[PDB]
Write a protein that binds this ligand. Sequence first.
Ligand code: MG
Ligand code: MG
Ligand code: MG
Lengths: 49, 445, 445, 445, 94
Amino acid sequence: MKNVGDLMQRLQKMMPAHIKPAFKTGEELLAWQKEQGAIRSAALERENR
Amino acid sequence: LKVPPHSIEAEQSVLGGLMLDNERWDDVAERVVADDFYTRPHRHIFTEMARLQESGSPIDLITLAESLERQGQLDSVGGFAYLAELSKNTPSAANISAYADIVRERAVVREMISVANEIAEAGFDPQGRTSEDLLDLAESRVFKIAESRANKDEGPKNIADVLDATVARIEQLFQQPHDGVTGVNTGYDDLNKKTAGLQPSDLIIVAARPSMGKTTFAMNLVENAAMLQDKPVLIFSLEMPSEQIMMRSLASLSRVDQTKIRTGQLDDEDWARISGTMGILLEKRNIYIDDSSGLTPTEVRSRARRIAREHGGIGLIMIDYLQLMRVPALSDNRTLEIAEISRSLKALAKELNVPVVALSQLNRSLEQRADKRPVNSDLRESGSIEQDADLIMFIYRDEVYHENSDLKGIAEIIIGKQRNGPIGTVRLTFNGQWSRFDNYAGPQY
Amino acid sequence: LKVPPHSIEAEQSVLGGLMLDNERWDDVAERVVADDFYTRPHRHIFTEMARLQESGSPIDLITLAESLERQGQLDSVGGFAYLAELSKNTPSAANISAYADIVRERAVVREMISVANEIAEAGFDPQGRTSEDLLDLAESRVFKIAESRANKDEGPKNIADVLDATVARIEQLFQQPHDGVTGVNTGYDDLNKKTAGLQPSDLIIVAARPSMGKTTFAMNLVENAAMLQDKPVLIFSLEMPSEQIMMRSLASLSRVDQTKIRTGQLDDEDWARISGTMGILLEKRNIYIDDSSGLTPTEVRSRARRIAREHGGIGLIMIDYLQLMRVPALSDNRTLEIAEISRSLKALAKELNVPVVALSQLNRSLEQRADKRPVNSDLRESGSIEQDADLIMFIYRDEVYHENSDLKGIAEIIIGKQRNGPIGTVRLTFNGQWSRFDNYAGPQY
Amino acid sequence: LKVPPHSIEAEQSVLGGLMLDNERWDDVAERVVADDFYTRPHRHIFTEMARLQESGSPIDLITLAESLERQGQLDSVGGFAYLAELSKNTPSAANISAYADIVRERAVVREMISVANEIAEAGFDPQGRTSEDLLDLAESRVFKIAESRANKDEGPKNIADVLDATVARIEQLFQQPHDGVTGVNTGYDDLNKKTAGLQPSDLIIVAARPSMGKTTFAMNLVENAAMLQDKPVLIFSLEMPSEQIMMRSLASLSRVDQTKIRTGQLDDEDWARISGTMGILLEKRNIYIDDSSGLTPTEVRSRARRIAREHGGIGLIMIDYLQLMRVPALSDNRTLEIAEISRSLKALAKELNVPVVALSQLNRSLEQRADKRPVNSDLRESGSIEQDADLIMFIYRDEVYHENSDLKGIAEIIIGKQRNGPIGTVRLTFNGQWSRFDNYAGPQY
Amino acid sequence: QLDSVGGFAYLAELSKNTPSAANISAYADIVRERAVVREMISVANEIAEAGFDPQGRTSEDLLDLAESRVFKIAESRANKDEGPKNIADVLDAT
Ligand SMILES: [Mg+2]
Ligand SMILES: [Mg+2]
Ligand SMILES: [Mg+2]
């Protein structure tokens, strides 16, 4: 029914240009996620304490 | 119907695997033995290849025959014409270890029935004999069976084994990249240790109370597995439809909240991270979702196998709130209905050689108890699915219950059982505003 | 000229196709089922073939014969010579699934003949009841087999398709510029945040101990809806009749005591505010109260589908003290009765695409606890209602237990589960003299 | 044994009843239809009589025959002599609308047979039809038949009808300007404020430990509403017989201690008040007492319907310590037993529109609290009595526990539940020697 | 349910019959009176044949059965002065 092209085009119809994802891949995703995980845990334990 | 049970197809397949692979002899030898087989020529070939893999490295087609000729046994085990069929058959992939283990199991069973007949004879045949020396015979026999067992991990350990690790510490422990994993990477390094990943031919059970986050976890697993594997994964969501599952998953990945997604209060700094993970989830086409209501295990089997054939072989099955699964045969008796469904899912796990994620609930027997850290019995039906599964693991987020807590944001994954390893208790962190468990950076447990 | 039709040439053609096409087992399984045949020997053959194709793959003519033999059943289903006559015939290759389609279609026709014959016979001699239940029996069989068949668009789909629907939702929500209320508004602004409004396919629950404000709060929800929502609403007052509900609602809407309505001791300002709320409620014609006591989910679905087709589509349902709902089939077991109730109400909400406010009492477990705030466990029966719901929100009003409290006139709405939103503890003000909850712009919580 | 269902004696019976009755026609017209009949001559008669009842009011024997002649149809519908058979017989009484309703639903039954025949006709004759144009077709058939549903006295109840009834009640109340007691009076002028009297249809519950004064309180309510209302009151003393109740009541009304009564040791001023209270009680003839032990609710119903028939209509019921009441079907599960009981009592109050007092007990959960002032959760069983009730009002006179208490002769009536009104703490004064509660002129509570 | 309980004309015949007067109390009296006797002889038969067939029983465990059934009849029947009494009928005994 629809492919990457048409779907992402309809997606840009929602949200404008220069929205580049800064992941592009499967490993940097999990890496930055773990980074933010530890950074969040820092202020989390801070808020607990 | 009634016969000596012995695997022969996978037997010849293992033998041809040893033919076409000189490498895979060690671990397969740790389980299968010459006495582990049923017929004679298979035993001959195994003992020959064992003697040769001790010394004679190249054995696929010819050196077996050469040794067989050195000892002069041609046409005693069939013949070279009988042998050619063995290298001919079994072009199978790396799935040989499971074959080896099940053939070991079949050998143990064969020993068991042999001993059973021996004991029947001993009972019918006293030969002027007190039953003291007869029950003692039987009990000594049973213990001699279960003693050796080729198994040394479920139980205590001699100090030799203890001091192995103790001294291995002080010299060899540079091993901190312990990524020792066999199966589906869960996506949780603190958890992947104690479980060794999802062994691809077992039954998983993820269960806890409803406000606790289990579905979030069992979505995080398939969510990672779609990305790491290049293999499909299935989602039987018998509770709620796809449009909420996916809206959750996008938020788990991108690290934004479902609210802004279903509302529209989200700027560039979220738009980008949604677009990226969306693009990733399109460029693989792994995941398939089924928003059914009242599936039967027959339909589970059918709808796993419609896809197992098309796309190589599927990698993971995920059932949501199992108990909704019906079978109109046992529409009256609930207990045997649940036990039927459990056995059926375990059968499917055996069939496709894939892991089955299949959730369940906890009855309200812990809430008349201050512990509230569940156990194997608090399992809501039949006491049956604590037997048909090689794995169970429960959850506990204390800050649903205690508002004062200093254990908040945190959620231990108790592992309540394993039949291929040790149990434990992981300690993750929960941030449900974007519906995710993360690996925890903190003190001991 | 007249017969239950069955194409038997195409039937046996599909049989022999499954015989000499051993790969293709699922494609025909998409449409053929064991009982789907017209003739029983074919049922025997197909169930043997299916049992083997699960476990034993290679079967065309002869190992299926051995499987039939292992239980000693040769010639009980015709004979193996006839089975070879099956295997010999039908060299068709192109089309099996279409033959299976027409065979299953004829089987559906056949079962329709069966059902119609059952109706005619159970109109001639159905053996004793009031025919009010007979009309319901017709409708029940009708809609049951409707739900048993109709879903054949069902199947696992692709993320490139699921995301289309997901992004459609995100489009029509991101399209429409409105505040964070994607659903039905409650009127309470501090409860719409934790809820985003009563979402349109859920089973909301509103529980609390007997005199705490269940019916009161729920009527305030439907009032605020009816005044805001421009679509009907239903009120299943199983407990107490309309002529109390509506006094209570007039007071809720116009802030005057119940006594000054059930006594006539009221002043000009009050006479006026009554005239106003009345002349409002008459112009819209939203509300529809059922003052019948012992309803079933069948009847609830019937009445709701009736108000639906005529008056557009409903927007909200309220069900007072769920536990009065019945289903006489399961009157011997109460837990299963409540389970059927809950599943029926969820399915209803999913059918008409509305919410279903479903009150429920609580058990006397929280009394011997010293906190008295209810937990998700303390629900009156079956514990399925703590599983089948997208939202629970208990009620707690401390002035009932504590006369030493500095927290009176204050009723707090302890959320206890929400699958797609946060837990919380909302806070509101109770003035039961006119049966209203109002917002509490006071200190934090 | 098996035949197309249709009844014909009711047919001719209704027709002749209309022949001998021009007054009552609309009531049968609301149920029966022209097509509702089986035979066409009677269809002609019914539709012609109905056309005339629109146009020509007097239709008994000759106006209808003359009309049927004006359409030129004599001897096509039998004959005028045959019609004389119709007009001669069936002089039956007012049980005519019963015939109307049953024949209405018999038309519905015959419709069911016809429609099942239609479905079986589409079945035998597929007409090359798709399953999706088959099921939903034949199912929307029954749905379309359900759409008829002339039983328009149920769930689809628009708001205006509710408000019509409510305004009618408010006119019942305001057209009679009186004090703020819209209900039964008690005599206790401090209690009617928090209660507005005992409402006619609610189920009242009076509850206290075994020697706290609840039989006494209830007897005072009944024997005061016997003196005020000129309307009967029943007493189901399941616990003690009449010969103690009435002694107690003589002492209550006449204020003489019971010991002077039975021992015969009383003085002239006492004998006078005895004479007076008896001369009242017999010059009103208003009280009935049933000293039966194990009454099921059906027995209670029947024995109250009798007095609601013979002696006008009743105004109060009192049931002592309902935990005696049985329903032998549920003898094993006590909880469900009591729930049935309470539901039956509520239904009785709604059937007769008269208040049911239902004394209950309390569990021993007060004693391990040190407060002892009871709450709803301290009811003896089932928790339905705290759900199917509308006014619980406990009794706690404190000198029973605290010997050294400054409240001797004080018994406070803790209204612990009330739907249509407030909770509170009434105070009274206990004078037990003559078995009375009296009002209390005292400080601010 | 038709024709398992006789017939339709069978049903009508009962209505056509018995235009008798208000002596319904006495008729229902005797019609009630006879069935308890029928149950009594039924129980007598049961007790006797159960005596013929002890099924691991002693006389002590058998006269107990007899007492139990006979008085379970008697108590279940004997309370036939029941009803809500007018107050005069109460105060007379008082
Ligand atoms: Mg879930
Ligand atoms: Mg209520
Ligand atoms: Mg008493």
